[PDB]
Design a binder for this molecule. Structure first.
Ligand SMILES: Nc1ncnc2c1ncn2[C@@H]1O[C@H](COP(=O)(O)OP(=O)(O)OP(O)(O)=S)[C@@H](O)[C@H]1O
Ligand SMILES: Nc1ncnc2c1ncn2[C@@H]1O[C@H](COP(=O)(O)OP(=O)(O)OP(O)(O)=S)[C@@H](O)[C@H]1O
Ligand SMILES: Nc1ncnc2c1ncn2[C@@H]1O[C@H](COP(=O)(O)OP(=O)(O)OP(O)(O)=S)[C@@H](O)[C@H]1O
Lengths: 398, 189, 398, 308
């Protein structure tokens, strides 16, 4: 019954890791008790060092593991995979997750526990690598591939995976990494230089990977711009180095499998164009679609809570989530009709890309509110108007 | 209907054409007797028998061949020079590049550099060459693009191997082309 | 009920800003004054300073801060992009409010309130930007896409707006800009340079963007030239380069998602060729169709007023507006005949775009009855015939 | 190019593990036997056709490279009378294209002087694995409308003729993978005579793959209860009758039937996949493990049906 708890401690402090560990330990021993987080701390030292503590999913204190992490505030350090002859950006090499990725996992909400699927997949990867399982009798190349409609989180999930994996494996690995390779900056006007550049790029990746503790997730966000259909892109000739980069990419990925600390997260909006040698080389060809009614409800709950926080909406209220709405009996006794209307909107807002779903409160406010401060039912009916108008805009564009 | 892209060889082949050229000129300029008459590019090219010198050229040029591919190069100059590292024969490949015709007119090039020994006066033997890479940026800007090669290092524009003089150009060629303005000319001193 | 006022201050005048603010307070609050404009008469010194004062939609108890402005009299500023031998203007660059775009926003007539929504979009953008709403919980990418049948005021609303805003947002943003993008310079015959300089152009736009007072307005006309659908066919048709630009624009439309001084106005009339990962990033996706009857009548009113001002018409007569026409009861009187007959001409000419609706006076005086000064008693009929001609000119075209 | 002196520590488990039910492996064996025996027999090619070229083809990720490597191992150990050892060369077509000819020609010339030095002693048996041959015909299809052909087509043709230069001796074998079943524009399609097709393993191979996988999972106690499974010969002599001792075999046989045509490489990753998602435990019992593997094969089929 392992339960994970992670604490964000403020970057100003410098207290020793195990002292704050035992401090939050007797903090839990004071609490002894659903995914919940705190910021209203009591103890002084506790206030000076930690910013928040979070329980992530009636289990009081059966067993807990404690993770401590230090959010970075500086941006990605760019790199030029070239001899400085031509100035072209190559990869936005990150570091242990920056403050920009904070809250990203909480923002993304998925229908049926795919998030956990990738979680225990990578956990199993390390677990099997631990028992020294023989490579040849059973093996696996790491490649993950996410595909589906646009706006479903697939170029927002690889980064969040980097985040939470670097958070969780902190006890085992001191720092993580991330390399968002820029696909368009790999080819060249001269021929036979794309092959020279791809091997240098992945050789740099290997150099970065050499620290057997250093966790590395390569991120190729637009593989269909990097793996052109090998037979299709040969009819109606392209230059020599069009299906001469796909082979080198495949060879280096098949080479990378013999290193213990690698994941390769890739995304694709278009599947019919990627490859036949790739679309079968990925372990979890996971398909992410538009969120369902419960995921949409959680999305709108987060949005409305945030707008209550920033005072775009004047009076704070309470919205009961779905699992409380089950127990209340769905009665009309003037306590949860607001959540019922929100559920109706969640019902009628099916099929939207899930990027429009975060956009929609802002659009609704802008177009149909024309005021700087509102109550709750007005904003809800405005959101209903906004989803209807989004349907009309989809219809009129054919 | 298939519209389509292109695959230029533009900036690199030049120096490696220079390779042939230099392998010819190192022969013709009488600055190589360890050279042998051979056959390549349908001409009586005179190359070197030493594979060691072949790999020396691999380092000197074929390592910078995509590094020379920057279009900033103005004068690819074979300075034919004495121990002081100052020219007597400025084979100034003034590469005025407007970015198989290339060998169609380097046929004339190779062929006439071959004939240049009927124009080149008797240059004293025992004098080597330097590949002066005249760029658009002075004083060897961006050391990386010139020291691309790991085992083969580069140097800045030190005062000795940076200048030349005595520019008496008898333009043995002026072979303009499509991709190239190979204003090669042999500036005697 | 706030009502706005714009005051045009000549380039000749040099009196400082606040001096003319107080001068125009003296002016407006000695008159103590839906849209009625005055010229710079009624006082000497302001006649030496200002040109026109205009109000936009009665006692005016709450007024606005006067929007007082000088038009710039220098047109485009061509800015090449290639390192050597560009020879193709890649981006025209106005500094709003320029001279040519003057009066443009008022000529255009839409009777569906596209201007209201497309206007309040930016105001709400500012409202959410200044009060610091979290990006992760509510976000939006700043893209506007306009589509409809050809020639209906889609490029003329993507430029009449990038001026009107700089007039409205003068207190906050102190000079606007406008970059008109030359799509056909971005592409290239060379192997990989087709996207490797789209990134360069958006890099230049970013470099313009860093100055946190500017109000950059990127404009892409006829987007289909830039984001043609990714799936054409497997052959050499649309080579591998045209798969990797459409997802090079998309990886730059979202790297300038974080700034709040940017808008991206884009036009297209054949939507079914725009890639679907772009048709979803757009934030408004507005459709503007050919004008209705009231818009037609207003257009003809504007044209007639302009001519009888320019004296291509006999001694002028007054015309009535739909409000006054409905107020009088459509009675045939000493003045209403022209109003009713022009109403019939308007009620006949629906279905035509704006271009033809504005050509029509010129043709009706160029082909039909021609005598350099023509009376309105006849000229209106001389227009009606032209109308029918166009319809006939369609039938013979089938 | 890569290089292997002799089947090394990475070269046993493949051939001991690659499992096809058409017994194509024995077919490759005796085909190559016939080829070598005829060659040393000095039979003439004009009346009866025989070439030292073997081409392997089929869907991608089905063993072709592993089959070539393990076949090289098997032939070099089996031929324990003529060659004391072998040499496996994996020539990558990528690294041969310099900027223009006068470099690539010298490069390929040096590579094949090394090859000639290798073959000069006919004591051994030498292979070449031209990995993908279609990477030599695409560069030839662009004579117009592409890169400068003098630097692309000329080099690949000067390699194609050196292939016939090397193939002329009496102890060489040519191995290639294509992955298209219609034809190849290079002179390795019509002129090739050993053109064996490889596909997904059949229902009788899933059992042998899965038993080896489960045994490997047994080796280090990932599955705690060490229960004994029975080779297919047992299920066929028993009569396929259920009992208390040979039931796991039954369930695994149903699984093998359900997992007919996925792939070679995929049917090797499925236990790891099932353990990763559907087991969620540090140690497993085989009884629930087989049900998890059922869910995993169902999942893999559902995915391959979900990619439209
Ligand atoms: N479950 C969710 N609920 C609400 N919003 C979501 C959810 N998942 C993702 N998003 C939003 O989607 C955005 C990320 O979009 P991406 O997945 O990166 O788009 P994309 O797939 O890269 O688009 P392409 O390249 O055209 S397929 C984030 O800003 C999130 O706010
Ligand atoms: N609603 C309108 N009323 C009057 N004139 C209009 C209207 N809409 C457009 N116009 C005329 O449109 C003329 C300009 O044509 P454009 O607007 O360039 O057409 P477009 O509308 O740009 O359509 P495209 O894409 O460029 S086909 C303007 O000067 C207006 O006179
Ligand atoms: N039927 C199979 N039986 C046993 N092991 C297999 C089988 N198929 C694949 N394997 C192993 O799984 C991996 C598959 O990779 P390869 O054998 O190299 O495939 P391939 O021949 O390269 O196919 P392509 O056309 O190049 S993608 C290898 O490590 C094989 O050893």
């Amino acid at each position: 019954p392992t339960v994970h708890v992670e604490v964000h401690q403020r970057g100003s402090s410098t207290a020793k890791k195990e002292d704050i560990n035992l401090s939050v330990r007797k903090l839990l021993n004071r609490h002894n008790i659903g995914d919940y987080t705190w910021t209203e701390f009591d103890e002084p030292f506790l206030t000076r060092n930690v910013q928040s503590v979070s329980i992530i999913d009636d289990l009081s204190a059966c067993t807990v593991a404690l993770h401590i992490f230090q959010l970075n505030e500086d941006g990605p350090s760019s790199e030029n995979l070239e001899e400085e002859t031509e100035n072209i950006i190559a990869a936005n090499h990150w570091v242990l997750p920056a403050a920009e990725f904070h809250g990203l996992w909480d923002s993304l909400v998925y229908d049926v526990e795919v998030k956990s699927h990738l979680l225990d997949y990578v956990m199993t990867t390390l677990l099997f690598s631990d028992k020294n399982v023989n490579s040849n009798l059973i093996t696996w190349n790491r490649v993950v591939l996410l595909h589906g409609p646009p706006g479903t989180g697939k170029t927002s999930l690889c980064k969040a995976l980097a985040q939470k994996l670097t958070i969780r494996l902190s006890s085992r690995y001191r720092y993580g990494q991330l390399i968002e390779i820029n696909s368009h900056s790999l080819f060249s006007k001269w021929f036979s230089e794309s092959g020279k550049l791809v091997t240098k790029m992945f050789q740099k990746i290997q150099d970065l990977i050499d620290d057997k503790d250093a966790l590395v997730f390569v991120l190729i966000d637009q593989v269909e711009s990097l793996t052109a259909a090998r037979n299709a892109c040969r009819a109606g000739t392209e230059p020599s180095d069009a299906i001469r980069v796909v082979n080198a990419v495949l060879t280096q990925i098949d080479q990378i499998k013999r290193h213990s600390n690698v994941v390769i997260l890739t995304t694709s909006n278009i599947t019919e164009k990627i490859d036949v040698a790739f679309v079968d080389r990925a372990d979890i060809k996971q398909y992410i679609g538009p969120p369902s009614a419960a995921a949409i409800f959680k999305i709108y709950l987060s949005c409305l809570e945030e707008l209550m926080k920033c005072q775009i909406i004047y009076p704070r209220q309470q919205l009961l989530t779905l699992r409380e709405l089950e127990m209340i009996g769905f009665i009309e006794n003037n306590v949860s009709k607001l959540s019922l209307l929100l559920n109706d909107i969640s019902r009628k807002s099916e099929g939207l890309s899930g990027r429009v779903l975060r956009k929609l409160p802002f659009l609704a406010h802008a177009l149909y509110v024309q005021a700087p401060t509102v109550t709750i039912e007005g904003f809800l009916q405005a959101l209903s108007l906004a989803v209807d108008k989004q349907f009309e805009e989809r219809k009129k564009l054919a | 209907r298939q519209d389509l892209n292109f695959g230029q060889v533009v900036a690199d082949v030049l120096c490696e054409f220079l390779e042939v050229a230099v392998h010819l000129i190192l022969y013709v300029r009488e600055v190589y007797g360890i050279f042998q008459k051979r056959k390549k590019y349908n001409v009586p090219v005179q190359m070197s028998c030493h594979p060691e010198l072949n790999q020396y050229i691999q380092d000197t040029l074929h390592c910078v061949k995509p590094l020379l591919e920057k279009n900033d190069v103005e004068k690819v100059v074979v300075v034919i020079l004495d121990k002081e590292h100052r020219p007597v024969e400025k084979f100034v490949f003034e590469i005025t590049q407007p970015p198989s015709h290339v060998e169609q007119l380097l046929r004339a090039f190779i062929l006439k550099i071959s004939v240049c020994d009927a124009v080149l006066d008797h240059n004293p033997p025992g004098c080597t060459f330097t590949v002066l890479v005249h760029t658009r940026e002075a004083a060897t800007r961006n050391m990386e693009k010139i020291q691309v090669i790991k085992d083969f290092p580069w140097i800045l524009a030190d005062e000795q191997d940076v200048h030349m003089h005595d520019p008496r150009l008898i333009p043995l060629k002026t072979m303009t082309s499509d991709i190239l303005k190979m204003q090669l000319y042999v500036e005697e001193r």
